[PDB]
Coordinates of C-alpha atoms and ligand atoms in Angstrom, one line a residue:
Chain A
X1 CA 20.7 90.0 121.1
X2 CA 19.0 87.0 122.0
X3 CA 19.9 85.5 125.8
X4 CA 18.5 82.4 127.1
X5 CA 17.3 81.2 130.3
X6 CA 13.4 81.4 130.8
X7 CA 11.0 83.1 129.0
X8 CA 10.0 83.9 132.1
X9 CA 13.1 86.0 132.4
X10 CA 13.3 87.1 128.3
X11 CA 10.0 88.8 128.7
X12 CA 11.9 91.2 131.2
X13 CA 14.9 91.2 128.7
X14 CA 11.5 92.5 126.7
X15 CA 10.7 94.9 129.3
X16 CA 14.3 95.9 128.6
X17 CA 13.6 96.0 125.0
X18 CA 15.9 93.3 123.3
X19 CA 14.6 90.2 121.9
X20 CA 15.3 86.8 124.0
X21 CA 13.9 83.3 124.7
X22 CA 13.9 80.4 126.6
X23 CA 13.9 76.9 125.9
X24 CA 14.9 74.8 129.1
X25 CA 16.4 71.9 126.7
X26 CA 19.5 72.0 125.1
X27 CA 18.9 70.6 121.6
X28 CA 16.2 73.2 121.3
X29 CA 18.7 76.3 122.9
X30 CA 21.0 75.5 119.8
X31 CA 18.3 75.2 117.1
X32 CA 16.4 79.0 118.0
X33 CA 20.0 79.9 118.5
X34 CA 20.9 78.5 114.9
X35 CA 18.3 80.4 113.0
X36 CA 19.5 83.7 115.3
X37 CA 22.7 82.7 113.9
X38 CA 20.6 82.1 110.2
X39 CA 18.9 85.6 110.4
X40 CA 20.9 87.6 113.4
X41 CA 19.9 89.5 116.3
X42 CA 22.8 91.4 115.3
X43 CA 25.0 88.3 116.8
X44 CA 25.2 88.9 120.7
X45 CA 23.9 85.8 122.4
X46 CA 24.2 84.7 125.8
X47 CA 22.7 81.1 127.2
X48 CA 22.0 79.8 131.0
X49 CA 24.9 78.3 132.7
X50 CA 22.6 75.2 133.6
X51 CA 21.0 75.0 130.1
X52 CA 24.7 75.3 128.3
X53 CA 28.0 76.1 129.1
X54 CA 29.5 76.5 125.6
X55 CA 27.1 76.7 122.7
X56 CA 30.1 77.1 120.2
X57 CA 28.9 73.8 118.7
X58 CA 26.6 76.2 116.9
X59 CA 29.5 78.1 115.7
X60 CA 31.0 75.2 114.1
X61 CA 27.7 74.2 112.7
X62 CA 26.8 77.2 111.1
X63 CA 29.4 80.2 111.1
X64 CA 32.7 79.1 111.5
X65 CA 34.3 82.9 110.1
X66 CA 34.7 86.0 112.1
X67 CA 33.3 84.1 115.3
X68 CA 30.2 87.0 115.3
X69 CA 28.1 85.6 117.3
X70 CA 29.8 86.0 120.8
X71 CA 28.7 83.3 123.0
X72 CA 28.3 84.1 126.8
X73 CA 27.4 81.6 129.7
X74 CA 25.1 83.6 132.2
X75 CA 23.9 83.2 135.9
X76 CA 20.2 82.1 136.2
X77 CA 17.2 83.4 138.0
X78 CA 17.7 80.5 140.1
X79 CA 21.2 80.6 140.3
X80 CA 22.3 83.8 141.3
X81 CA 21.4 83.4 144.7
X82 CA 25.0 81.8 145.0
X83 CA 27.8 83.3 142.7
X84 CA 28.5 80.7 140.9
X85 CA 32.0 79.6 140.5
X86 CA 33.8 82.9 140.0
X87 CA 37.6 82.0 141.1
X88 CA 36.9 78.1 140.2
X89 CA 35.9 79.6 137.3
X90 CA 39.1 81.4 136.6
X91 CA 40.9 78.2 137.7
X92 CA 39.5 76.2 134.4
X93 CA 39.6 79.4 132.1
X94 CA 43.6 78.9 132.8
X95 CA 43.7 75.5 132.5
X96 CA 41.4 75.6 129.4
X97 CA 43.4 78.5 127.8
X98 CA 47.1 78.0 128.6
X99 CA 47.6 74.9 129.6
X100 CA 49.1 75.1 132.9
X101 CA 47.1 75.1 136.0
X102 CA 48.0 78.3 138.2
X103 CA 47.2 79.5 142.0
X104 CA 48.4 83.4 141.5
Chain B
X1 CA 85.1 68.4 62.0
X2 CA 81.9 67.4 60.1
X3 CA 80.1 70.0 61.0
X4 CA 81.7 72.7 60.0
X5 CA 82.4 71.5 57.1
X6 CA 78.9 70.9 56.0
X7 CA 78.1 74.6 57.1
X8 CA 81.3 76.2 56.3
X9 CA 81.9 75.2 52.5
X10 CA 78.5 73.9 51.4
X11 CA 76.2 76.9 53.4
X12 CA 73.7 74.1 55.5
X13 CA 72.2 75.3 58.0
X14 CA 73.8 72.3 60.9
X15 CA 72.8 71.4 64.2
X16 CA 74.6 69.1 66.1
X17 CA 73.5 67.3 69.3
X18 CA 76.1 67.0 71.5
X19 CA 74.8 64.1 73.4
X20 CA 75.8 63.3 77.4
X21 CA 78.5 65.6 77.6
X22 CA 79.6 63.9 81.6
X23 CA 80.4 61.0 79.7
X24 CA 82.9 62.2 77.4
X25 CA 84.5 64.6 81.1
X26 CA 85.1 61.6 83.0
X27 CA 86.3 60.1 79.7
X28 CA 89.3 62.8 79.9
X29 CA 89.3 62.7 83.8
X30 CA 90.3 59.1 83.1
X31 CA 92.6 59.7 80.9
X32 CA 94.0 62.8 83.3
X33 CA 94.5 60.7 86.5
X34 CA 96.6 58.6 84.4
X35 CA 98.6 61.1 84.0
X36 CA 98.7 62.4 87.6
X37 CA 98.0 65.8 85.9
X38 CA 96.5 68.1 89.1
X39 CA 93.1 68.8 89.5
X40 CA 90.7 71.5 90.0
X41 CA 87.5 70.8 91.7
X42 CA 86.5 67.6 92.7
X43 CA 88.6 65.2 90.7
X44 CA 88.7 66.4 87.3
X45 CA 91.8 68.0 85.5
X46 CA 93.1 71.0 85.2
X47 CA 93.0 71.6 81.9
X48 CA 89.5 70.6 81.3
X49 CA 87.8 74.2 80.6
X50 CA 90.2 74.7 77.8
X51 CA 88.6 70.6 76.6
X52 CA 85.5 72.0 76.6
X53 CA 86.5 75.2 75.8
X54 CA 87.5 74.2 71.9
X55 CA 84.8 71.9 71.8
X56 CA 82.0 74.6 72.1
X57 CA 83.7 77.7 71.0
X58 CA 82.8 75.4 67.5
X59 CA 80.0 77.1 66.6
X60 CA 78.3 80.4 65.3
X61 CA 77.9 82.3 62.2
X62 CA 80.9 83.8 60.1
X63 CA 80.8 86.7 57.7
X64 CA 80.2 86.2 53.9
X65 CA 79.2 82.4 54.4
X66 CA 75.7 81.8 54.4
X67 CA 76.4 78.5 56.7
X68 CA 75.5 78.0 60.7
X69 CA 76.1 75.6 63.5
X70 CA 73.8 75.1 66.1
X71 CA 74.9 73.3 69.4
X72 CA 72.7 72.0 71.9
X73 CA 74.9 69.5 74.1
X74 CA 73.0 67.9 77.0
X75 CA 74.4 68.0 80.1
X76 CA 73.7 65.4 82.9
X77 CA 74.1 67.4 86.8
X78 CA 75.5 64.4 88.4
X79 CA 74.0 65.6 91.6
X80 CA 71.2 67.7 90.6
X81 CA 73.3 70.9 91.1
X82 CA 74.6 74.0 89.4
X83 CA 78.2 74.0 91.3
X84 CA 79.6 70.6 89.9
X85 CA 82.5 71.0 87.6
X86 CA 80.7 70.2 84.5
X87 CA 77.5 72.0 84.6
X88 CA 79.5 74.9 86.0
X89 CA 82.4 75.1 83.1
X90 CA 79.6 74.5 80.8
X91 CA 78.1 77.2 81.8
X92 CA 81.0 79.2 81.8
X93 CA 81.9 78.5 77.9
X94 CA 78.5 79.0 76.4
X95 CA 76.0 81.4 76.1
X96 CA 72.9 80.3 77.8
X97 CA 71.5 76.8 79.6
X98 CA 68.2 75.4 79.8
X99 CA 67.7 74.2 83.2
X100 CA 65.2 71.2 83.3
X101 CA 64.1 70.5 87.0
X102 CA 62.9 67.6 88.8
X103 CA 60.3 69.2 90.9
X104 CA 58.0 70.2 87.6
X105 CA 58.5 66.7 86.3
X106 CA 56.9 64.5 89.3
X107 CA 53.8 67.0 88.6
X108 CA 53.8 65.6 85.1
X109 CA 54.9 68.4 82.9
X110 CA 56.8 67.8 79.8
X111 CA 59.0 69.6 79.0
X112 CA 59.8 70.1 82.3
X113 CA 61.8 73.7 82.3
X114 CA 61.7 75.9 84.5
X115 CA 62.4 79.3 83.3
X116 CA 63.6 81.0 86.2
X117 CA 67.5 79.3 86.7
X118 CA 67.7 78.9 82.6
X119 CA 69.0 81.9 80.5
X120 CA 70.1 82.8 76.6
Chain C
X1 CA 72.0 66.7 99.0
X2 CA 72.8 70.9 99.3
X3 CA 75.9 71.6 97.1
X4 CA 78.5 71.4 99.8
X5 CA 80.6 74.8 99.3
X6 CA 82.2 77.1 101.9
X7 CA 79.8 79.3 101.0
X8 CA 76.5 77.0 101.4
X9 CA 77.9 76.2 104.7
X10 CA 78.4 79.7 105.6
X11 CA 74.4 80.2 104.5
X12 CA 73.6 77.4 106.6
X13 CA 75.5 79.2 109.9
X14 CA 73.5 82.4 108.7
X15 CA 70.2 80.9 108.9
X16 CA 70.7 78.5 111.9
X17 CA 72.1 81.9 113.3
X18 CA 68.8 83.3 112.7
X19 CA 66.8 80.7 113.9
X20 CA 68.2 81.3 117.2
X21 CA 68.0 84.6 117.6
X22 CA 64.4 84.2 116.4
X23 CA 63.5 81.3 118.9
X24 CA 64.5 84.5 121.5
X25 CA 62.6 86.5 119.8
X26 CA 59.2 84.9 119.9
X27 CA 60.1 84.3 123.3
X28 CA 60.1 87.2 124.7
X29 CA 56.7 87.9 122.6
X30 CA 55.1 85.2 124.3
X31 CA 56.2 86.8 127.6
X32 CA 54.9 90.1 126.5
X33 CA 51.3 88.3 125.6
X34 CA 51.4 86.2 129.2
X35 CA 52.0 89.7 130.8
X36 CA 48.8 91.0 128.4
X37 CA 46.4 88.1 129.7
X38 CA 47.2 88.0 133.3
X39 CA 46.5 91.9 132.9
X40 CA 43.2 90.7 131.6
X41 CA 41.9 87.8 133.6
X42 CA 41.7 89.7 136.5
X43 CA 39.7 92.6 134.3
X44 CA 37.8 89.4 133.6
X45 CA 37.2 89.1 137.5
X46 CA 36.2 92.2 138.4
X47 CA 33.7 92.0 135.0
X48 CA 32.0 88.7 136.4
X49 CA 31.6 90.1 139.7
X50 CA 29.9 93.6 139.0
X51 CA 27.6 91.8 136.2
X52 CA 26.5 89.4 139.2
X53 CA 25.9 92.0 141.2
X54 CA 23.9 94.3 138.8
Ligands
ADP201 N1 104.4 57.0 83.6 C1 104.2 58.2 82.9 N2 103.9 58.2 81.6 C2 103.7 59.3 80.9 N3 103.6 60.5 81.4 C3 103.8 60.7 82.8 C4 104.1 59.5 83.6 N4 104.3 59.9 84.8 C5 104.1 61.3 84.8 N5 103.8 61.7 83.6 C6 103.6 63.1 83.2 O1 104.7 63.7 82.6 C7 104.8 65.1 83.0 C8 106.3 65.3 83.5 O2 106.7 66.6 83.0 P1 108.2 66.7 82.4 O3 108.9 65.4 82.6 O4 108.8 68.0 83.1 O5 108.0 66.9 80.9 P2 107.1 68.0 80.1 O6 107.8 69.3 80.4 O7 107.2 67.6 78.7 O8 105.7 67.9 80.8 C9 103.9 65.3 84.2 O9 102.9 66.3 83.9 C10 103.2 63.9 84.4 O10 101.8 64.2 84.4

């Protein structure tokens, strides 16, 4: 259940007790992420918004069936002093997913 | 006329190959617009079944002679279809057809028959 | 190309017939989906905002 922003912070998702890392690059977020993919941490990953967005490139490299690893953007140690975008957010998750743009 | 006499009084075994038989139809469609005899479907006389009729009904086995005819005529669909005249009152005659279809021969298959529209 | 009988062209009405009742039809299951995912985006609002918060 690997989840990626610092080690900094994966050693507290240690003191949680599940498995994470950091990397702080984003060729290197997709390659740990890639053998997580290769041998699973049951498939439950989530990566810093400022380190990547959408890692699904990894889904298309390695596991393009049954989409198993879900793929989550998360708010930093360093970010979530601001709640990040949340109705912005919204905003391009309509136009990404629909098409139209909406106000609702 | 041939035929049945080689099978009828001499006990051969015949099988005659009825080649193009749309050829020999508009033949007697010719022949029946002349005439302005009226036409069934799509051009071709009325009395064309009963043509086509005592050409095929030709054929088969009789009791006590040993003799046989065979027929195999081949038919031409003009437009690739079952419901023009000719395929359709051949297939009303006879007893069975053998279908060959277009779509098995661009795949390169000889002989290209599909089983599914042909009977006997 | 078809073999033009009354009947083919009664098969033809059939299906076009069909077709339209069927471009209806997946209509209103694309309305029924829309009213699924705006019940759900807002779900997905109310998710962000508590896993922000916690
Ligand atoms: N110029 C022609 N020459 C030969 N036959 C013809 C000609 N015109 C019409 N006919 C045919 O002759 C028939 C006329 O029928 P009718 O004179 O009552 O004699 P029948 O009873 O012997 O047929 C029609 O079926 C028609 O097709």
């Amino acid at each position: 259940m690997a989840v990626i922003a610092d080690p900094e912070t994966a050693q507290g998702f240690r003191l949680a007790g599940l498995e994470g890392y950091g990397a702080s690059s984003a060729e290197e977020a997709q390659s740990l992420l890639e053998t997580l993919v290769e041998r699973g941490g049951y498939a439950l990953v989530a990566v810093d918004e400022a380190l990547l967005p959408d890692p699904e490139r990894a889904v298309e490299r390695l596991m393009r069936g049954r989409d198993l690893p879900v793929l989550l953007p998360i708010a930093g140690l360093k970010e979530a002093f601001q709640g990040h975008d949340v109705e912005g957010y919204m905003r391009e998750l309509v136009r990404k997913t629909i098409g139209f743009d909406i106000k609702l | 006329t041939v035929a049945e006499y080689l099978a009828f009084e001499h006990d051969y075994h015949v099988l005659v190959i009825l080649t193009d038989m749309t050829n020999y139809c508009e033949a007697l469609r010719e022949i029946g617009a002349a005439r302005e005899e009226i036409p069934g479907r799509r051009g071709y006389p009325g009395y064309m079944y009963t043509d086509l009729a005592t050409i095929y009904e030709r054929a088969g086995v009789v009791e006590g002679k040993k003799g046989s005819v065979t027929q195999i005529p081949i038919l031409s669909m003009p437009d690739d279809d079952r419901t023009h005249p000719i395929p359709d009152l051949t297939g009303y005659i006879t007893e069975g057809q053998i279908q060959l279809s277009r779509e098995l021969h661009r795949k390169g298959i000889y002989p290209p028959i599909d089983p599914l529209p042909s009977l006997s | 190309q078809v073999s033009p009988t009354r009947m083919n062209l009664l098969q033809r009405r059939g299906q076009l017939r069909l077709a339209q009742k069927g471009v209806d039809l997946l209509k209103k299951k694309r309305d029924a989906l829309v009213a699924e995912f705006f019940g759900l985006v807002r779900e997905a609002m109310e998710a962000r905002k508590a896993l922000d918060q916690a």
